[PDB]
Curated annotation (Swiss-Prot), chain A:
Residues 1-27 are mitochondrial matrix. The chain holds residues 1 to 55 of 385 of the full protein. A ubiquinone binds at Y16. This is Cytochrome b. It is found in: Mitochondrion inner membrane. Component of the ubiquinol-cytochrome c oxidoreductase (cytochrome b-c1 complex, complex III, CIII), a multisubunit enzyme composed of 10 subunits. The complex is composed of 3 respiratory subunits cytochrome b (COB), cytochrome c1 (CYT1) and Rieske protein (RIP1), 2 core protein subunits COR1 and QCR2, and 5 low-molecular weight protein subunits QCR6, QCR7, QCR8, QCR9 and QCR10. Component of the ubiquinol-cytochrome c oxidoreductase, a multisubunit transmembrane complex that is part of the mitochondrial electron transport chain which drives oxidative phosphorylation. It comes from the Eukaryota. It comes from Saccharomyces cerevisiae (strain ATCC 204508 / S288c) (Baker's yeast).
Curated annotation (Swiss-Prot), chain B:
PANTHER family: CYTOCHROME B-C1 COMPLEX SUBUNIT 2, MITOCHONDRIAL (PTHR11851:SF209), METALLOPROTEASE (PTHR11851). Keywords: Electron transport, Membrane, Mitochondrion, Mitochondrion inner membrane, Phosphoprotein, Respiratory chain, Transit peptide, Transport. One of its GO terms (cellular component) is respiratory chain complex III. GO terms for biological process: aerobic respiration; cellular respiration; mitochondrial electron transport, ubiquinol to cytochrome c; proteolysis; proton transmembrane transport. It comes from Saccharomyces cerevisiae (strain ATCC 204508 / S288c). Present with 35700 molecules/cell in log phase SD medium. Component of the ubiquinol-cytochrome c oxidoreductase (cytochrome b-c1 complex, complex III, CIII), a multisubunit enzyme composed of 10 subunits. The complex is composed of 3 respiratory subunits cytochrome b (COB), cytochrome c1 (CYT1) and Rieske protein (RIP1), 2 core protein subunits COR1 and QCR2, and 5 low-molecular weight protein subunits QCR6, QCR7, QCR8, QCR9 and QCR10. The gene is QCR2. The lineage of its organism: Eukaryota, Fungi, Dikarya, Ascomycota, Saccharomycotina. This is Cytochrome b-c1 complex subunit 2, mitochondrial.
UniProtKB/Swiss-Prot annotation, chain C:
It is found in: Mitochondrion inner membrane. The gene is QCR7. It comes from the Eukaryota. Present with 10100 molecules/cell in log phase SD medium. The keyword Repeat does not apply. InterPro entries: QCR7, QCR7_sf. This is Cytochrome b-c1 complex subunit 7, mitochondrial. Pfam families: UCR_14kD. Its main location: mitochondrion. It is a peripheral membrane protein. It comes from Saccharomyces cerevisiae (strain ATCC 204508 / S288c) (Baker's yeast). The keyword Zinc does not apply. Belongs to the UQCRB/QCR7 family.
UniProtKB/Swiss-Prot annotation, chain D:
This is Cytochrome b-c1 complex subunit 1, mitochondrial. The keyword Oxidoreductase does not apply. The lineage of its organism: Eukaryota, Fungi, Dikarya, Ascomycota, Saccharomycotina. The keyword Transport applies. Component of the ubiquinol-cytochrome c oxidoreductase, a multisubunit transmembrane complex that is part of the mitochondrial electron transport chain which drives oxidative phosphorylation. It is a peripheral membrane protein. GO terms for cellular component: mitochondrial inner membrane; mitochondrion; respiratory chain complex III. Present with 19300 molecules/cell in log phase SD medium. One of its GO terms (molecular function) is metal ion binding.
Length: 55, 352, 125, 431
């Protein structure tokens, strides 16, 4: 089978982000979740760099 | 060790080694099948893999067919590569490894698939039942392996010992120069094969009549009749089959197929009526049996049965050819019947 | 809310000529505003199926109705994703908007309720 | 080995072979299903069926003649086989049916009994012959609203609405002289046949030409005939191939031989020198597959067909197969090409030289109708052996690399991913 499916780490990525079967009709309201993950990343990255200069 | 041939200006040659080892001679049920499935496996000097890889680069393929009487090892290839395929075929007949793992991993699976394909076609289940009742143990032997009686690797080896001998096989190269062919055959390992005996019996098989078998089957229903023919009375049955399978006969659209299996010591005529529902199968065969009892022919299909029996350019060694231009009438004595399918709604040998 | 319960209340309203003439017209207007018929759906196609009653019911549905429900559902998703409605001549008509799955659902709820009753039957000597 | 062809009033084409026991004679018209309309689709198949009618067939059986017909896309053919001596009586039956009985075959009792037979015939096809059914739909979507899209057997709806007049209308527009070629194969000489033809005069609708149309075109698309009740998935996928009389006609056929055909149950098949087999046998991605390079007058299809019971891994089947095809543009090896040459010759030989003259007629007839002649088997081999790795790469980089595809399938194809996923695999990422 394809490597993205056989590898222990990549298969997680494949099942959640590549081959994950989505209902054909979801609308833009279903885009908020990815936006929340992105927000989480922005908060963490910017906070760590600021922590470097914070007392 | 008959070495036939027939050159030509064409680019594709076809070596072939007919061998009298079909189910007719099989010592144990399906052993001929297993052996046929074992050909082209590993030899003692060349693996099945290498044989294929080598022949592909040259430009030729192999194939091993099974008959009720034969086991043919054919090889199609480009003309000028003749020696290679002669030795390949020689190698198989003289020294195939017969490893226990080749049995379990390639032979048994391939044979199981063969039996599976055949177990799903009702006409073939019938055709098998026909042979088994007419010739109760000669040509009525099971064609394919099904495991009813044990068959070890040794049994397959023993059977190969009997059947693979110089006095029981015939080389036959189509589109090849007989000169070089005989030269290569004798120069190869064919001549080293321990020539045993020819199991080809001339005496007519002890056939039976008025026998019937009924097999319950899920799918299309099929009613069939089988008639044991004589060594000389087979030319009329040949025209009969081609008559029933032509626009001349009115009842040609009431049957699925009809043929004559020509052997070396006789033959067998078969008639197949196959359809979805039992009602149509009953009427169609009941009509045939009635119209054949009040037989007729007048030989109008004499030029047709002669033309259709000539389109077989691979069998330029057929029995009688001018025997057709003789008899012109046909009746219908005792025959054999087999009901397959919706049995409870199918005719018996009585009401026919 | 069980379909047995919706049927109880609904049938009571449908029988009484007082309520029947008052509610049905309201209900009819509610159904048209819902809009599912413009997507080619029948109300029964809209029932949430992720529960045992609905699975038992859908399992028992004859083939022809099953293939039909499948086509209607697929056609609805495709139309929804294109942000259009079907051409008016393709809409489901009121005569067609029949409760085809309802009898199978009611039957399964009754069977289920009886099992629940029998598994908990008390005995008096 | 000789391809003789001369024109006097009609174009006569023959190929003799003395070792042949029988001789086949027939007329091959330069028009097939590709000349029909969406509405009279199935008329050619219908013609073939009356030509083989119980009545017309019995007349030839008494005389000792056997009938055979074949409806294709670019052409159509009616053949009569006979013994080497009755080579004259075949022409009597040929003329008697295309001029004398061109009104006796079309009776309101024969036509109806025949129409009822092609209806049960075409219905049986659609209901059970899934691989050919899928291949037919592949042409249908690949060449939609174009001549090559029409199926050869015609459609049930256009068939049941067909009448005697439609047959006539077609016959009077395509069964013309300028759109015909008389072919003879078997053992008879060219001079032997042409004399019996140039003997009987009469032109019959001479100077008349068939109607024209619009050029065939490939459109990347798909048709999915999902059916979860079937026990397998049958799929066919292809790119725009090569038309006959194309410089890359042979490069294309060789390319298809590289991947060849396969059958998981045949021990020998599992051993072929095909790299794709290492990938597909591990989890048994399919029961069988076969590549092809279909060529027609205006276009062709290059791709493969496959059948499988591994319904949850169809995406791996498609993915590995397309990754292999990517190789043709960038890394096909000398030995793969050489293996293909040898196997292509072997198959091309087995076709052009079988023990059946009726096959020879169809091959000869079809070729002469398009290029006015037939390339000798020995001439082909010269072209085949001259192909280099550089040729295959230039071809693939034009026909396979990042090119649209056409897909068709039936059975349990829920696992066959969307178009774009398949289409994306027609190439690879690179720096
Ligand atoms: C150390 C890593 C770090 C992480 C992880 C982090 N922060 Fe912060 N955050 C800080 C620091 C440092 C400050 C003070 C600097 C500032 O005021 O922006 C801060 C301040 C804030 C403030 C005050 C903003 C203001 O007005 O100045 C908010 C609100 C906030 N964080 C929200 C979040 C949220 C929500 C998350 C997580 C989802 C998050 N933070 C994760 C370090 C972090
Ligand atoms: C079924 O439906 C789905 C669905 O399943 C998915 C997966 C998605 C896609 C969305 C996602 C997968 C969102 C996922 C998000 C997360 C898992 C967030 C994880 C968050 C983190 C913050 C990771 C932690 C990171 C760090 C520690 C790195 C920061 C530090 C750095 C760079 C060190 C810097 C220091 C130096 C010295 C240079 C859909 O959109 C969707 O609907 C359409």
């Amino acid at each position: 089978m394809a490597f993205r499916k056989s590898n222990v780490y990549l298969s997680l990525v494949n099942s959640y982000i590549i081959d994950s079967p989505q209902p054909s009709s979801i609308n833009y309201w279903w885009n908020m979740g990815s936006l929340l993950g992105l927000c989480l990343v922005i908060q963490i990255v910017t906070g760590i760099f600021m922590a470097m200069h914070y007392s | 060790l008959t070495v036939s041939a027939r050159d030509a200006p064409t680019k594709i040659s076809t070596l072939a080694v007919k061998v009298h080892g079909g189910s007719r001679y099989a010592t144990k049920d399906g052993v001929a099948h297993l052996l046929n499935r074992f050909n082209f496996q590993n030899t003692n000097t060349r693996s099945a893999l290498k044989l294929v890889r080598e022949s592909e680069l040259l430009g030729g393929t192999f194939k091993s067919t099974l008959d009720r009487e034969y086991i043919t090892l054919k090889a199609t290839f480009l003309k000028d590569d003749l020696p290679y395929y002669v030795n390949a075929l020689a190698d198989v007949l003289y020294k195939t490894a017969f490893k226990p793992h080749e049995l379990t991993e390639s032979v048994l699976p391939a044979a199981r698939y063969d039996y599976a394909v055949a177990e799903q076609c009702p006409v073939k289940s019938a055709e098998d039942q026909l042979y088994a009742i007419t010739f109760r143990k000669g040509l009525g032997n099971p064609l394919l392996y099904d495991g009813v009686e044990r068959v070890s690797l040794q049994d397959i080896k023993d059977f190969a010992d009997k059947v693979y001998t110089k006095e029981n096989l015939e080389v036959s190269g189509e589109n090849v120069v007989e000169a070089d062919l005989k030269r290569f055959v004798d120069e190869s390992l064919l001549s080293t094969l321990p020539a045993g005996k020819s199991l080809v019996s001339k005496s007519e098989p002890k056939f039976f009549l008025g026998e019937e078998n009924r097999v319950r089957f899920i799918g299309d229903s099929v009613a069939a009749i089988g008639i044991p023919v004589n060594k000389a009375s087979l030319a009329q049955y040949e025209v009969l089959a081609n008559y029933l399978t032509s626009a001349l006969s009115e009842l040609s659209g009431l049957i699925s197929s009809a043929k004559l299996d020509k052997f070396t010591d006789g033959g067998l005529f078969t008639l197949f009526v196959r359809d979805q529902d039992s009602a149509v199968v009953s009427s169609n065969i009941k009509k045939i049996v009635a119209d054949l009892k009040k037989g007729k022919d007048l030989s109008p299909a004499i030029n047709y049965t002669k033309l259709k029996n000539a389109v077989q350019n691979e069998s330029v060694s057929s029995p009688i050819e001018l025997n057709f231009d003789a008899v012109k009438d046909f009746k219908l004595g005792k025959f054999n019947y087999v009901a397959v399918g919706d049995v409870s709604n199918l005719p018996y040998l009585d009401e026919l | 809310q069980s379909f047995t319960s919706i049927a109880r209340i609904g049938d009571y309203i449908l029988k009484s000529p007082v309520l029947s003439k008052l509610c049905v017209p309201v209900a009819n207007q509610f159904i048209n505003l819902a809009g599912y018929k413009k997507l080619g759906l029948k109300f029964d196609d809209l029932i949430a199926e992720e529960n045992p009653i609905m699975q038992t019911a859908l399992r028992r549905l004859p083939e022809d109705e099953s293939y039909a429900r499948a086509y209607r559902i697929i056609r609805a998703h495709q139309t929804e994703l294109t942000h259009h409605l079907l051409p008016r001549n393709e809409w489901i008509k009121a005569q067609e908007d029949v409760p085809y799955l309802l009898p199978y659902i009611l039957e399964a709820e009754a069977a289920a309720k009886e099992k629940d009753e029998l598994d908990n039957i008390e005995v008096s000597k | 080995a000789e391809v003789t062809q001369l024109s006097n009033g009609i174009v006569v084409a023959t190929e003799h072979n003395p070792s042949a026991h029988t001789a086949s004679v027939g007329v091959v018209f330069g028009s097939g299903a590709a000349n029909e309309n969406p509405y009279n689709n199935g008329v050619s198949n219908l013609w073939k069926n009356i030509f083989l009618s119980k009545e017309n067939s019995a007349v030839a059986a008494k005389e000792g003649l056997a009938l055979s017909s074949n409806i294709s896309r670019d052409f159509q053919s009616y053949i009569v086989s006979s013994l080497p001596g009755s080579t004259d009586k075949s022409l009597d039956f040929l003329n008697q049916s295309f001029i004398q009985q061109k009104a006796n075959l079309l009776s309101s009792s024969n036509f109806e009994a025949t129409k009822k037979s092609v209806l049960k015939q075409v219905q049986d096809f659609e209901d059970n012959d899934h691989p050919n059914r899928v291949l037919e739909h592949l042409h249908s979507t690949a060449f939609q609203n174009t001549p090559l899209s029409l199926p050869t057997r015609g459609t049930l709806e256009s068939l049941e609405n067909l009448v005697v007049a439609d047959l006539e209308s077609f016959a009077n527009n395509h069964f013309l002289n300028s759109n015909a070629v008389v072919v003879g194969t078997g053992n008879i000489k060219h001079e032997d046949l042409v004399n019996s033809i140039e003997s009987k005069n009469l032109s019959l609708q001479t100077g008349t030409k068939p109607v024209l149309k619009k050029k065939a075109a490939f459109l990347g698309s798909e048709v999915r005939l999902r059916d979860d009740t079937l026990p397998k998935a049958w799929i066919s996928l292809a790119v725009e191939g090569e038309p006959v009389n194309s410089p890359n006609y042979f490069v294309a056929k060789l390319a298809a031989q590289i991947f060849g055909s396969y059958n998981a149950f045949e021990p020998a098949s599992r051993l072929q020198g095909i790299k794709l087999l290492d990938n597909i046998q591990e989890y048994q991605l399919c029961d069988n597959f076969n590549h092809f390079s279909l060529s027609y007058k205006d276009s062709g299809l290059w791709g493969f067909s496959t059948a499988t019971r591994n319904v949850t891994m169809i995406d791996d089947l498609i993915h590995f197969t397309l990754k292999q095809w990517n190789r043709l543009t960038i890394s096909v090896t000398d030995t793969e090409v050489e293996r293909a040459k040898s196997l292509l010759k072997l198959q091309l030989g087995q076709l052009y030289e079988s023990g059946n003259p009726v096959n020879d007629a169809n091959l000869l007839g079809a070729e002469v109708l398009i290029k006015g002649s037939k390339l000798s088997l020995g001439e082909a081999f010269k072209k085949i052996d001259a192909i280099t790795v550089k040729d295959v790469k230039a071809w693939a980089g034009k026909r396979l690399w990042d090119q649209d595809i056409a897909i068709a399938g039936t059975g349990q194809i829920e696992g066959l991913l969307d178009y774009m996923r398949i289409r994306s695999d027609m190439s690879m990422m690179r720096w």
